[PDB]
Amino acid sequence: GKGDVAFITKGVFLGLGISFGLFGLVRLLANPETPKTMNREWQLKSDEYLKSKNANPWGGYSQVQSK
Amino acid sequence: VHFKDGVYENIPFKVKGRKTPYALSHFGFFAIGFAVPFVACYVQLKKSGAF
Amino acid sequence: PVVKTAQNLAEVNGPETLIGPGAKEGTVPTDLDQETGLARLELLGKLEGIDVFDTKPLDSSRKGTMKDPIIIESYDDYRYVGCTGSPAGSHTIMWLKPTVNEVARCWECGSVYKLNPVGVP
Amino acid sequence: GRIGESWVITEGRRLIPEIFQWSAVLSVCLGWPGAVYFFSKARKA
Amino acid sequence: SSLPPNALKPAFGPPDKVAAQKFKESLMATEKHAKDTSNMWVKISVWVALPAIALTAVNTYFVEKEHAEHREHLKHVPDSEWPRDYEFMNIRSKPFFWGDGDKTLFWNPVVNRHIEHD
Amino acid sequence: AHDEETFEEFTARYEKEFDEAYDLFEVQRVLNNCFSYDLVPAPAVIEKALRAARRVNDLPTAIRVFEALKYKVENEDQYKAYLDELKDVRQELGVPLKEELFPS
Amino acid sequence: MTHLERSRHQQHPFHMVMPSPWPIVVSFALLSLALSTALTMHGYIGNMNMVYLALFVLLTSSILWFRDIVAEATYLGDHTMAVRKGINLGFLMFVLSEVLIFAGLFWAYFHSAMSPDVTLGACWPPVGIEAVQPTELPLLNTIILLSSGATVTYSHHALIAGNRNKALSGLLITFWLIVIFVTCQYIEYTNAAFTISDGVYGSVFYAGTGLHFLHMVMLAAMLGVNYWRMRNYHLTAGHHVGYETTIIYTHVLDVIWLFLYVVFYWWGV
Amino acid sequence: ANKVIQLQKIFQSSTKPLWWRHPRSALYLYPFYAIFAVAVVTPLLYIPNAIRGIKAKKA
Amino acid sequence: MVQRWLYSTNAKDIAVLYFMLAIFSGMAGTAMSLIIRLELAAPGSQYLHGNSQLFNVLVVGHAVLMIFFLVMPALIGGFGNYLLPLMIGATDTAFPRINNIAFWVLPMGLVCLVTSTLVESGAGTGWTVYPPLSSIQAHSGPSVDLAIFALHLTSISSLLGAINFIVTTLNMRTNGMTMHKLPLFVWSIFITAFLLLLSLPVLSAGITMLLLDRNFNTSFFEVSGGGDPILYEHLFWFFGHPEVYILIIPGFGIISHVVSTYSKKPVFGEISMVYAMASIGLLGFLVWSHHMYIVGLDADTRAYFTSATMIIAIPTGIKIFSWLATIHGGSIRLATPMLYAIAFLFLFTMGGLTGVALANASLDVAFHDTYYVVGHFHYVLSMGAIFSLFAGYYYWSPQILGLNYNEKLAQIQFWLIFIGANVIFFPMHFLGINGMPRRIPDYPDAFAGWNYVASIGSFIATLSLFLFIYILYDQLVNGLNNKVNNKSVIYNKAPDFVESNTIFNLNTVKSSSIEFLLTSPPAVHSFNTPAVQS
Numbered sequence A: 001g002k003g004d005v006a007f008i009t010k011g012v013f014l015g016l017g018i019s020f021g022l023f024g025l026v027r028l029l030a031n032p033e034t035p036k037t038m039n040r041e042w043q044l045k046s047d048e049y050l051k052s053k054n055a056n057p058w059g060g061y062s063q064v065q066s067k
Numbered sequence B: 001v002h003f004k005d006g007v008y009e010n011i012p013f014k015v016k017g018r019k020t021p022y023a024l025s026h027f028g029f030f031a032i033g034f035a036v037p038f039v040a041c042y043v044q045l046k047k048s049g050a051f
Numbered sequence C: 001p002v003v004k005t006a007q008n009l010a011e012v013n014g015p016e017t018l019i020g021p022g023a024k025e026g027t028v029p030t031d032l033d034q035e036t037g038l039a040r041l042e043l044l045g046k047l048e049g050i051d052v053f054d055t056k057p058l059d060s061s062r063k064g065t066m067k068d069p070i071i072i073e074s075y076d077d078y079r080y081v082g083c084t085g086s087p088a089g090s091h092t093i094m095w096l097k098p099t100v101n102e103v104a105r106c107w108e109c110g111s112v113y114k115l116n117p118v119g120v121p
Numbered sequence D: 001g002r003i004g005e006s007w008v009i010t011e012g013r014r015l016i017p018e019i020f021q022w023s024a025v026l027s028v029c030l031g032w033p034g035a036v037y038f039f040s041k042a043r044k045a
Numbered sequence E: 001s002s003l004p005p006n007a008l009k010p011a012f013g014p015p016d017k018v019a020a021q022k023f024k025e026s027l028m029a030t031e032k033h034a035k036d037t038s039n040m041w042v043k044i045s046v047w048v049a050l051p052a053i054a055l056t057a058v059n060t061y062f063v064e065k066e067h068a069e070h071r072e073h074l075k076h077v078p079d080s081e082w083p084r085d086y087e088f089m090n091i092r093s094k095p096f097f098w099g100d101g102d103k104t105l106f107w108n109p110v111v112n113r114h115i116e117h118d
Numbered sequence F: 001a002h003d004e005e006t007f008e009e010f011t012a013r014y015e016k017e018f019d020e021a022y023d024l025f026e027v028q029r030v031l032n033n034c035f036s037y038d039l040v041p042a043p044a045v046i047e048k049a050l051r052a053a054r055r056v057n058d059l060p061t062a063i064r065v066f067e068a069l070k071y072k073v074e075n076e077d078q079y080k081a082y083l084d085e086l087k088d089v090r091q092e093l094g095v096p097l098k099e100e101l102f103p104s
Numbered sequence G: 001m002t003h004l005e006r007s008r009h010q011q012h013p014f015h016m017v018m019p020s021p022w023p024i025v026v027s028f029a030l031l032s033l034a035l036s037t038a039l040t041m042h043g044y045i046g047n048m049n050m051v052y053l054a055l056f057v058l059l060t061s062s063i064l065w066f067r068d069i070v071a072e073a074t075y076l077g078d079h080t081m082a083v084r085k086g087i088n089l090g091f092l093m094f095v096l097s098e099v100l101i102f103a104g105l106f107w108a109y110f111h112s113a114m115s116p117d118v119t120l121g122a123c124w125p126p127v128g129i130e131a132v133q134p135t136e137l138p139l140l141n142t143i144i145l146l147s148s149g150a151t152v153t154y155s156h157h158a159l160i161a162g163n164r165n166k167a168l169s170g171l172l173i174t175f176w177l178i179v180i181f182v183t184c185q186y187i188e189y190t191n192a193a194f195t196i197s198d199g200v201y202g203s204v205f206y207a208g209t210g211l212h213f214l215h216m217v218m219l220a221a222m223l224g225v226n227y228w229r230m231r232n233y234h235l236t237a238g239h240h241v242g243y244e245t246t247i248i249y250t251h252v253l254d255v256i257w258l259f260l261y262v263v264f265y266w267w268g269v
Numbered sequence H: 001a002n003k004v005i006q007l008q009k010i011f012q013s014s015t016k017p018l019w020w021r022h023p024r025s026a027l028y029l030y031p032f033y034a035i036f037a038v039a040v041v042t043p044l045l046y047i048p049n050a051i052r053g054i055k056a057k058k059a
Numbered sequence I: 001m002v003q004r005w006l007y008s009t010n011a012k013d014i015a016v017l018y019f020m021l022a023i024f025s026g027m028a029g030t031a032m033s034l035i036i037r038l039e040l041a042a043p044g045s046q047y048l049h050g051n052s053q054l055f056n057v058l059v060v061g062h063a064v065l066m067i068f069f070l071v072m073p074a075l076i077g078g079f080g081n082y083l084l085p086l087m088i089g090a091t092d093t094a095f096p097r098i099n100n101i102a103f104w105v106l107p108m109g110l111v112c113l114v115t116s117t118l119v120e121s122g123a124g125t126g127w128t129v130y131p132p133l134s135s136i137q138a139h140s141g142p143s144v145d146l147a148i149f150a151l152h153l154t155s156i157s158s159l160l161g162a163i164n165f166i167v168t169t170l171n172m173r174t175n176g177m178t179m180h181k182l183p184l185f186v187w188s189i190f191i192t193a194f195l196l197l198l199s200l201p202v203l204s205a206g207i208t209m210l211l212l213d214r215n216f217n218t219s220f221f222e223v224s225g226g227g228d229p230i231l232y233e234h235l236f237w238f239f240g241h242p243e244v245y246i247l248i249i250p251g252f253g254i255i256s257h258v259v260s261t262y263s264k265k266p267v268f269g270e271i272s273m274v275y276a277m278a279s280i281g282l283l284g285f286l287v288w289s290h291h292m293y294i295v296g297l298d299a300d301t302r303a304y305f306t307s308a309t310m311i312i313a314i315p316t317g318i319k320i321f322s323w324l325a326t327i328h329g330g331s332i333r334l335a336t337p338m339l340y341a342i343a344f345l346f347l348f349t350m351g352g353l354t355g356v357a358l359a360n361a362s363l364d365v366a367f368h369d370t371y372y373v374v375g376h377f378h379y380v381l382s383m384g385a386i387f388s389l390f391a392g393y394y395y396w397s398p399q400i401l402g403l404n405y406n407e408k409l410a411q412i413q414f415w416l417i418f419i420g421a422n423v424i425f426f427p428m429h430f431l432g433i434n435g436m437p438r439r440i441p442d443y444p445d446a447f448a449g450w451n452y453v454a455s456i457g458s459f460i461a462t463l464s465l466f467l468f469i470y471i472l473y474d475q476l477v478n479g480l481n482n483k484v485n486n487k488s489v490i491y492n493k494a495p496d497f498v499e500s501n502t503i504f505n506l507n508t509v510k511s512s513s514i515e516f517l518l519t520s521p522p523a524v525h526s527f528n529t530p531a532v533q534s
């Protein structure tokens, strides 16, 4: 009744934003260092090694996934 | 003896007539419920490594 | 004070009259001798002919509306009645709560239920 | 029916706008992995 | 104290149903049939069960005397002459928490020796 | 009866069920049990429903017949060719519709 | 009769039990037993004194519970015929759950027996293990259960009949008959060539026969309680549900013993 | 010894609860309360000794 | 008050305590799910640094705590104890001390399960606690002994509740309840209580065989010594599939009742639906080794089991078709338990379709111990049993508790748990078919995206439970004000079309079972007199 569909979609999107922010500031305190084979410079060598031995030839074989 | 019935005499919590607010007991129940795996993690992380 | 032990169902006077006499030194006890309380009440009833705790599905022969209702009996002020049509299984089971001060109308069958509340509280 | 607009038209008018919104709600109840893959660095973003 | 007018009216109807009186008279038929079928079963017991127990008792006394003289034969065997037996026999994953460590509940020290592998 | 009900047995059973009602609960109950079936009832049923709502002397259940029927029918050509069949009963009984009563 | 003295009763045949403190105490004792027997199996506490007192407090709380139920069943007098059929069906379902534990043990025996492993010598019974022959002592303590069943059924049918000197004699001799069974079963255990650790054969054999052993010592305790309350005039001629319970239990224990005995002593040797 | 109706006349006619209603029921429940309190409070002082990992002093 | 909550042989005041331990343990289990999915969010050793044994302890704690201490209490124990006497007209249940000891031996299983995760690092095996992973050579300590003593105690509790339920709906029915006239939740609790005492004896036998070959030197599954660990897989999964059918059948009953009462229509063919449910019960024993297609069974017995699990699949299909038939043509009033009932159909049909993708013994060689399996059971267990649990609470607790909740907060809680739990378990299928195994602390960093997406979803699924906790608080301190001040919905069954408001106030509740005719919080002796029925 009387615009409570607007209130419940406001509550849903506010809950998504609140959980996103709290996941971010929980993610902030996890661990300082990464495993060293996570940046793109390792990934280019790790899929050059793959195309040396033609693994996953028709599907996807390129692994980068890092900025 | 038939125990007398009401709207707040069906649950073990006393809600209306107290000295402390009800939010203390109601959120401390789930605080200890949510913090028993954290104290398990702490007693397991001081036994092997650090923390 | 003076108490006899209710030879059949007519002379019960509460929970102090269902005791009965004990067995002798050699005979095995029969259930008429030693059984007491509610079990003795049911045994004395079944030996008289009746059985207490009258379990029976209610009369759904006639429909019955506010000129002459369906009269139900209860020892309390309310009795939950599950109506299932003017035959025994016409429409699905709808539960009504006839009480002492209000009749219960079915809304799918249409029948009404009214108490004669026995009570004695 | 017998007299009126025909049942084929009067139920096509009711259901043909429903197919597109069904396709929308199914394409966003199963297709959000495409939307999360689209922005990541695996698609050379 | 102001009884409602439905107080002293009756509550149960006609108390002379033939069903419950024939129930009460079948309460004699069950007792008569029990007095027959207990005499029958005690004759079954004292004729059938007791001679079978006596014959099985003399059989088990004969072979229990044979097993007793065999256990007295394997009493005096020196323990290194007991045969080295297999991997599944006498497993010990963890020691038993009661006793010395190698002793079960009904561990007979004559028929169940732990060889300790010479 | 779990065997099916033909249309003539339907309209005869419900005409003899609208004739017998005396209270208001009975009229609304048998009206709900007539409308919550699968078919829409022929006007031989519904003019008798209007008379049975007149016998109890209350108005708005002699209007919600018409609005429940407008929800029942498949288009509005069926509704107009229906409503010109119950014209004079609506005239001398003096009940209104919804769209002219609440203009919106 | 009068409505005024009809509304002074239960109004339905079922039991309304007053609040009794013997779920909470026996649950406390079960927790203490579980933790103390998980704690003494690794040498954390010194002796078995504490698992002994935990088992003892469980036993005495449950026998106080059975004291409360015999007082409520025959003194306060609530066990009418509806409640009697209820507790009868409840005991039937409980024993149907016990025979499925026995079926799980028989599944273990069959699975490791009819497909024998290559470390047992690929033969059932395994090499070296002198199996128990079924004809010496197993024949006595498989005929003694049939004789026990015959005498407990004539003691039952003499209890229904009316004589006391026969219905008591049958119960006394079935108690001494099955305790003679239990003692010769312990005699069979204390001179046998294999222990519970000697291979998988001794393991599943002693598991099955020891579970039946504990079941019939619990039956002997049940029958001792039933003989005591038959001597003290509690058992009637038509309200003996706590005795029909134990004769159902001893007859199904007899048939599960014959199943266990056949496939543990004839086919498995 | 046919003492069931006297026990019934005693057990119906009291206010005390059922596990306290017998005459000789004082000898059955006081030592039970003592040994039960002891037997259930006693592993909860051995559980932190197990959490710390320190075993027994046996042998 | 000590005799009303500690002795308390009354089936209404035992169910509240069942529900209190249920919400406590469900909070603990979802804290463990949050810690697991928070550590699996990124490759490399996160929040718990190294220490894979701690992760194994956390995942067995999450699995066994949330199965045997949330879903089984809050579906069998709590809901059956409150409603099975209150639908068939018994004043309360038969054997009342038995379902008091069932409740009171639950939380001691809980406290020994909690203290099993502290001593000598801990039991890590997963909830399917296997040998020789759990034998004394490869796993030393008193940890897994307490961890399976918890299963002994929970096993005893559920069997005592099963015998209680079976006899209390086989004898103490009301005056007119015939053998087939009961409401369908009574039939679900009936058949579930049969499957308990037909199944869990085998479980307790197998796990006490595990205990006495851990500590009592026997050789049931110690393989160098005669035994075999395949016998434990048989003896465990013979319970392990009937256990989840036990956990899901009262869910079917709850969903049947709420879609019957929120669409103003009886369920389409209740007799065929209860025949399908009973055949599901008596058929769920014959397919116990569909979890063992890999271990080395013959192709012939694998062919038998992949034949029989599809005949397991068909009556669940006709149940879902009858649910679509009974919500078709209704007058659907979209309140907050009807929303959960509508979501349960889709979110369980999805998991059942991927389950019959798993059920092919051909196809199970590419999917076993793989996150595809997690995506299947965290649909049909999580969304299934707990959307039915939420559609049980939001539908029954205004009648039980007598305090009406807030409505808009209930709908944002439903949409938050729906979105934030659909985003977790849907990338688990892609992780499965790409090749991720189960129970790893973390993984080779190829599939580094879907774990991050699932971890950003688990925080939404936890925040919705925090909002459910606030819904419980707002119901407990603002019940009467939500009755009065127009924040809630008051009538779950709306008045029909041609019925007046003055005529709706005569027949307020148009129920079909007894429970919505008793007053809010009901009397402690509700049926003084029997409740007649024709």
Ligand code: HEA
Residues within 6 Å of the ligand: I022, I023, I025, I026, I027, I030, I032, I033, I034, I036, I037, I059, I060, I062, I063, I064, I066, I067, I070, I071, I074, I125, I126, I127, I128, I374, I378, I381, I382, I383, I386, I389, I390, I393, I421, I437, I438, I439, I440, I458, I461, I462, I465
């Ligand atoms: C009861 C069943 C159940 C449920 C609901 C869940 C739900 C969740 N589980 Fe899972 N899980 C298992 C049982 C379950 N799980 C099992 C058996 C395994 C296998 C273990 C193994 O094989 O090793 C497993 C494995 C498992 C994995 C795979 C790890 C691996 O093996 O490699 C993960 C990873 O995300 C996980 C985490 C979670 C999380 C974050 C949720 C979240 O969905 C949690 C959020 C849930 C809620 C918010 C529900 C509401 C909670 C309430 C308390 C409501 C109260 C209401 C009433 C009482 C009416 N658990």
Ligand code: HEA
Residues within 6 Å of the ligand: I128, I243, I244, I245, I247, I248, I290, I291, I292, I293, I309, I312, I313, I314, I316, I317, I318, I320, I348, I349, I351, I352, I353, I355, I356, I357, I358, I359, I360, I364, I367, I368, I369, I373, I376, I377, I380, I381
């Ligand atoms: C709640 C308990 C529960 C339920 C109900 C189910 C439901 C089903 N499950 Fe599941 N399952 C588990 C609990 C459950 N499962 C657990 C705990 C695991 C992990 C165990 C572990 O640790 O290894 C698991 C994993 C698992 C495995 C083990 C795979 C492996 O580990 O290697 C298998 C194998 O067959 C399986 C198949 C099925 C099938 C066919 C159904 C069916 O019952 C589903 C029925 C539903 C439908 C079929 C959909 C609705 C029907 C229609 C829409 C009609 C049309 C459909 C057809 C024509 C098919 N699932």
Ligand SMILES: [Cu+2]
Residues within 6 Å of the ligand: I240, I241, I242, I290, I291
């Ligand atoms: Cu399964």
Ligand SMILES: [Mg+2]
Residues within 6 Å of the ligand: I368, I369
């Ligand atoms: Mg596996």
Ligand SMILES: [Zn+2]
Residues within 6 Å of the ligand: C083, C084, C085, C086, C091, C094, C106, C108, C109, C110, C111
């Ligand atoms: Zn009716």
